[PDB]
């Protein structure tokens, strides 16, 4: 019964190896779980040829026994009592206010869902722009207010989605603030540049790892408060190992298996802080996924949500923003070893009762 969070994650993570791709050395931050959970509530209003191929690049059918309570499920446990402003998400659909919809199609949505498709008057278009903006803003505790995309609603512009996360974590155990100290990072260029670095020691869950075509990797563990979330680091040891033959094959399946081989270990980590914020047009990676015709304006298919269309979505957008940090004179115990983070990296962040995927990321520098 935790299936629906797997295959929701493994989505979110092809949509992710997809948009890591069209930015080789460029940082970039992002939610698995996030764009599955905007992409299961446009299968609704989607209909035919376009209907078939999200079904097939997700996996499962909204509409099917369990999937919509599932889902459901999952997102109030995500902001339960456990998350301390830790972990802000806002979904949401907008349609052109006009238009005739199907019947009974906006309570169906209700039922599933818990939220509604929302109606703006594409026509005043500096009145959307605004209405999408503070959906967002309002949803996010203020921490996410403008997308850039939303630059392109114009007076044709009839369904447009959206989505926004942002994530800040309490650490089981804090770094010590007088710990943190400017550091050497090498960048993937060759250069190097000086950086914030956190340290910590204790026992850290820990594995090598090697990829079936033999490219190498440390992999850390580091538990959020109370165990609810967890990061997960991994970096290569040696300086010409690329992130892409780690993200090419990620997978929910491939971090239980990290999770399998672990061992506490004594180590003194040393981390870049880092603020992220990225903003994704996910239609080429959409299309990339076989998704294309919901982007073209004849052959899309939204049938399930009006016959009088001619309907597609003109902007899908995914944003977000992360930020790792802590939560004179100083001491520490030594550690048999060191695990220095100054080269890039990738961190996935992961619901630990349900194994989603919240956040995945390349930091190529902090
Ligand atoms: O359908 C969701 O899970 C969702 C619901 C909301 O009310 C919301 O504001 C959001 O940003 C996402």
Redesign the pocket.
Known sequence: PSYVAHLASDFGVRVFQQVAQASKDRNVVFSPYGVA?VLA?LQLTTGGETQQQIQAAMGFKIDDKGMAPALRHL?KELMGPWNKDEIS????IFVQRDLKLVQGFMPHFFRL???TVKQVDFSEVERARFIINDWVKT?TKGMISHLLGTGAVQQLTRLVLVN?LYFNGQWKTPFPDSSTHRRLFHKSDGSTVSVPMMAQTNKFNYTEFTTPDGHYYDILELPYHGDTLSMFIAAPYEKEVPLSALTNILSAQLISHWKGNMTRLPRLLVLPKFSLETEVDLRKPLENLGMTDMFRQFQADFTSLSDQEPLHVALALQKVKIEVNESVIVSARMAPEEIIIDRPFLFVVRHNPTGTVLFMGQVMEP
């Open positions: 959970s509530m997102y998400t806002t979904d949401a869902f818990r939220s949803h926004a």
